[PDB]
Design an enzyme around this catalytic site. Structure first.
Site, PDB file in Angstrom:
ATOM      1  N   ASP A  68       0.837  -1.213   0.000  1.00 33.49           N
ATOM      2  CA  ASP A  68       0.000   0.000   0.000  1.00 33.49           C
ATOM      3  C   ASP A  68       0.868   1.258   0.000  1.00 33.49           C
ATOM      4  O   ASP A  68       0.440   2.325   0.467  1.00 33.49           O
ATOM      5  CB  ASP A  68      -0.888   0.019   1.246  1.00 33.49           C
ATOM      6  CG  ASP A  68      -2.225   0.731   1.022  1.00 33.49           C
ATOM      7  OD1 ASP A  68      -2.679   0.887  -0.175  1.00 33.49           O
ATOM      8  OD2 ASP A  68      -2.897   1.173   2.030  1.00 33.49           O
ATOM      9  N   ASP A  91       1.000   3.939   7.411  1.00 35.84           N
ATOM     10  CA  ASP A  91       0.114   2.875   6.964  1.00 35.84           C
ATOM     11  C   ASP A  91       0.773   1.571   6.590  1.00 35.84           C
ATOM     12  O   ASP A  91       1.086   1.304   5.414  1.00 35.84           O
ATOM     13  CB  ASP A  91      -0.896   3.302   5.869  1.00 35.84           C
ATOM     14  CG  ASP A  91      -2.129   2.446   5.926  1.00 35.84           C
ATOM     15  OD1 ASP A  91      -2.212   1.466   6.674  1.00 35.84           O
ATOM     16  OD2 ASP A  91      -3.100   2.888   5.158  1.00 35.84           O
ATOM     17  N   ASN A 117      -0.412   7.681   1.718  1.00 33.66           N
ATOM     18  CA  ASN A 117       0.335   6.910   2.709  1.00 33.66           C
ATOM     19  C   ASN A 117       1.753   7.434   2.894  1.00 33.66           C
ATOM     20  O   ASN A 117       2.501   6.851   3.652  1.00 33.66           O
ATOM     21  CB  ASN A 117       0.372   5.375   2.387  1.00 33.66           C
ATOM     22  CG  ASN A 117      -0.890   4.588   2.757  1.00 33.66           C
ATOM     23  OD1 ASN A 117      -1.825   5.122   3.359  1.00 33.66           O
ATOM     24  ND2 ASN A 117      -0.936   3.305   2.383  1.00 33.66           N
ATOM     25  N   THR A 152      -4.883  -0.454  -3.086  1.00 32.75           N
ATOM     26  CA  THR A 152      -5.643   0.700  -3.448  1.00 32.75           C
ATOM     27  C   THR A 152      -5.709   0.602  -4.971  1.00 32.75           C
ATOM     28  O   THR A 152      -4.689   0.526  -5.654  1.00 32.75           O
ATOM     29  CB  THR A 152      -4.989   1.977  -2.878  1.00 32.75           C
ATOM     30  OG1 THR A 152      -4.939   1.872  -1.470  1.00 32.75           O
ATOM     31  CG2 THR A 152      -5.799   3.206  -3.239  1.00 32.75           C
ATOM     32  N   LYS A 210       1.059   4.651  -2.003  1.00 31.76           N
ATOM     33  CA  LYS A 210       0.239   5.715  -2.496  1.00 31.76           C
ATOM     34  C   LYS A 210       0.681   6.949  -1.750  1.00 31.76           C
ATOM     35  O   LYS A 210       1.239   6.856  -0.655  1.00 31.76           O
ATOM     36  CB  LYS A 210      -1.267   5.453  -2.261  1.00 31.76           C
ATOM     37  CG  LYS A 210      -1.732   5.203  -0.799  1.00 31.76           C
ATOM     38  CD  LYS A 210      -3.150   4.675  -0.738  1.00 31.76           C
ATOM     39  CE  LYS A 210      -3.800   4.848   0.611  1.00 31.76           C
ATOM     40  NZ  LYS A 210      -4.792   3.793   0.879  1.00 31.76           N
TER      41      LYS A 210
HETATM   42  N1  LIG Z   1       2.229   9.395  11.798  1.00 34.87           N
HETATM   43  C1  LIG Z   1       1.323  10.201  11.206  1.00 34.87           C
HETATM   44  N2  LIG Z   1       1.510  11.537  11.263  1.00 34.87           N
HETATM   45  C2  LIG Z   1       0.608  12.367  10.677  1.00 34.87           C
HETATM   46  N3  LIG Z   1      -0.462  12.046   9.952  1.00 34.87           N
HETATM   47  C3  LIG Z   1      -0.531  10.701   9.750  1.00 34.87           C
HETATM   48  C4  LIG Z   1       0.227   9.739  10.423  1.00 34.87           C
HETATM   49  N4  LIG Z   1      -0.219   8.480  10.096  1.00 34.87           N
HETATM   50  C5  LIG Z   1      -1.295   8.696   9.372  1.00 34.87           C
HETATM   51  N5  LIG Z   1      -1.566  10.012   9.154  1.00 34.87           N
HETATM   52  C6  LIG Z   1      -2.760  10.417   8.382  1.00 34.87           C
HETATM   53  O1  LIG Z   1      -3.788   9.451   8.612  1.00 34.87           O
HETATM   54  C7  LIG Z   1      -4.352   9.035   7.343  1.00 34.87           C
HETATM   55  C8  LIG Z   1      -4.979   7.658   7.530  1.00 34.87           C
HETATM   56  O2  LIG Z   1      -4.188   6.769   8.358  1.00 34.87           O
HETATM   57  P1  LIG Z   1      -3.969   5.333   7.700  1.00 34.87           P
HETATM   58  O3  LIG Z   1      -3.685   5.513   6.253  1.00 34.87           O
HETATM   59  O4  LIG Z   1      -2.989   4.515   8.403  1.00 34.87           O
HETATM   60  O5  LIG Z   1      -5.414   4.659   7.884  1.00 34.87           O
HETATM   61  P2  LIG Z   1      -6.002   3.374   7.220  1.00 34.87           P
HETATM   62  O6  LIG Z   1      -7.310   3.002   7.830  1.00 34.87           O
HETATM   63  O7  LIG Z   1      -4.932   2.388   7.255  1.00 34.87           O
HETATM   64  O8  LIG Z   1      -6.142   3.855   5.715  1.00 34.87           O
HETATM   65  P3  LIG Z   1      -6.201   3.157   4.250  1.00 34.87           P
HETATM   66  O9  LIG Z   1      -7.594   3.207   3.785  1.00 34.87           O
HETATM   67  O10 LIG Z   1      -5.246   3.818   3.274  1.00 34.87           O
HETATM   68  O11 LIG Z   1      -5.789   1.798   4.421  1.00 34.87           O
HETATM   69  C9  LIG Z   1      -3.152   9.141   6.425  1.00 34.87           C
HETATM   70  O12 LIG Z   1      -3.480   9.085   5.050  1.00 34.87           O
HETATM   71  C10 LIG Z   1      -2.546  10.476   6.897  1.00 34.87           C
HETATM   72  O13 LIG Z   1      -3.172  11.635   6.376  1.00 34.87           O
HETATM   73 MN   LIG Z   2      -4.285   1.104   5.621  1.00 33.25          MN
HETATM   74 MN   LIG Z   3      -3.619   4.822   4.392  1.00 34.94          MN
END
Ligand SMILES: Nc1ncnc2c1ncn2[C@@H]1O[C@H](COP(=O)(O)OP(=O)(O)OP(=O)(O)O)[C@@H](O)[C@H]1O
Ligand SMILES: [Mn+2]
Ligand SMILES: [Mn+2]
Lengths: 336, 20
Positions: free
Chosen positions: A152, A170, A157, A187, A154
């Site tokens: 993943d 992520d 991420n 994705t 993108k």
């Molecule tokens: N360490 C961090 N610092 C700042 N912002 C972050 C951090 N980690 C994540 N984010 C924000 O949080 C968003 C979503 O977190 P994450 O992508 O892990 O969730 P997810 O449920 O795994 O999403 P996805 O649908 O892509 O799988 C990221 O795209 C980013 O904008």
């Molecule tokens: Mn994810």
């Molecule tokens: Mn994500």
């Protein structure tokens, strides 16, 4: 290099083997703002009261995780993130769970998502893109070396540090696997032919996704896009790619080798491993080492005004946090 | 143009991961 990785393999393993658990409590943090969202969970800017440090809290609703069948992947994610150690991966500070949720406290990467900037500027200059690319390269070589797959990649991420460098977040799909795997994960726009093909895959998927990334950053859009996913999958398998006129021949060619439908013809998945890429023309001025050392000229630097400044992220509706009187799915998450 | 084509598409915003 082989040298480095060698030593690297050992850390990981140790952590892999004895993963850490419950290093904190909800109470020890102050909920601030929501930084971003995903298909699974949410990320909030939080503050460690005893310390005064800000962090990024990832909340996962235990029931929601169970419903989307992400029980095994969540475990992987926490497990994998605590053990890796690389200059381009986010740092996981704490982790803990409660009656209703799972938390991962990571370092806060203020720069914002590459996405927002990319969509902002509209496009990155070949050299500016090569900078990020170069960082992703080293990150995969590192990850792949630990028998891991990221699956993943993108811009959503990818986070920008205070120095213009990449912080990869992520790890929701990350997996430690020696062999093939079959989960349909990713994705849409980043999905490799063999995934959409339900054919069994490996690390080569990380490589394909990289070409897609480089393309998007340089072009400003993805090579394959449509209004609905199925139409994308379809274009992706057609095996046809079109390059914008402003893509140097060098670029065009590297991409040709990355966006190779035939996985035995795929740069990264060949004899010369990652060397095929590192050695590529397009990469002839890249000082792999300086980069690893973060000693390179960072093209763009997001500027932020004050710790806890969230100007580089969009605004999100604040869902409120809720813990129940009763435990929800204890057994399923016994190891988090 | 392609760019123009992309910008009017329905996938310009943030893309979520696929699951079931
Ligand atoms: N360490 C961090 N610092 C700042 N912002 C972050 C951090 N980690 C994540 N984010 C924000 O949080 C968003 C979503 O977190 P994450 O992508 O892990 O969730 P997810 O449920 O795994 O999403 P996805 O649908 O892509 O799988 C990221 O795209 C980013 O904008
Ligand atoms: Mn994810
Ligand atoms: Mn994500």
């Amino acid at each position: 290099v082989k040298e480095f990785l060698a030593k690297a393999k050992e850390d990981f393993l140790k952590k892999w083997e004895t993963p850490s658990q419950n290093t904190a409590q909800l109470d020890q943090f102050d909920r601030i703002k929501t930084l971003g969202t995903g298909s699974f969970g949410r990320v909030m800017l939080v503050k460690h009261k005893e310390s005064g440090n800000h962090y990024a809290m990832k909340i996962l609703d235990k029931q929601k995780v169970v419903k989307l069948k992400q029980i095994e992947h969540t475990l992987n994610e926490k497990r994998i993130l605590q053990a890796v150690n690389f200059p381009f991966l986010v740092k996981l500070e704490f982790s803990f769970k409660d009656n209703s949720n799972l938390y991962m406290v990571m370092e806060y990467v203020a720069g914002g998502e590459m996405f927002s900037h990319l969509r902002r500027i509209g496009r990155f200059s070949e050299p500016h893109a090569r900078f990020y690319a170069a960082q992703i390269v080293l990150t995969f070589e590192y990850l792949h070396s630990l028998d891991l797959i990221y699956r993943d990649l993108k811009p959503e991420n990818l986070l920008i540090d205070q120095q213009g460098y990449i912080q990869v977040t992520d790890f929701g799909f990350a997996k430690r696997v020696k062999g093939r795997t079959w989960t349909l994960c990713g994705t849409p726009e980043y999905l490799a032919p063999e995934i959409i093909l339900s054919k069994g895959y490996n690390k080569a998927v990380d490589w394909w996704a990289l070409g897609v990334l480089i393309y998007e950053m340089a072009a400003g859009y993805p090579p394959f896009f449509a209004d609905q996913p199925i139409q994308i999958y379809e274009k992706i398998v057609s095996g046809k790619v079109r390059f914008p006129s402003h893509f140097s021949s060098d670029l065009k060619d590297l991409l040709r080798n990355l966006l190779q439908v035939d996985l035995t013809k795929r740069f990264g998945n060949l004899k010369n491993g990652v060397n095929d890429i590192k050695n590529h023309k397009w990469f002839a001025t890249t000082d792999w080492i300086a980069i690893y050392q973060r000693k390179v000229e960072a093209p763009f630097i997001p500027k932020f005004k004050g710790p806890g400044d969230t100007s580089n992220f969009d605004d999100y509706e604040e869902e409120e946090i809720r813990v129940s009187i009763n435990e929800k799915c204890g057994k399923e998450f016994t190891e988090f | 143009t392609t760019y123009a084509d992309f910008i009017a598409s329905g996938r310009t915003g943030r893309r979520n991961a696929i699951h079931d």
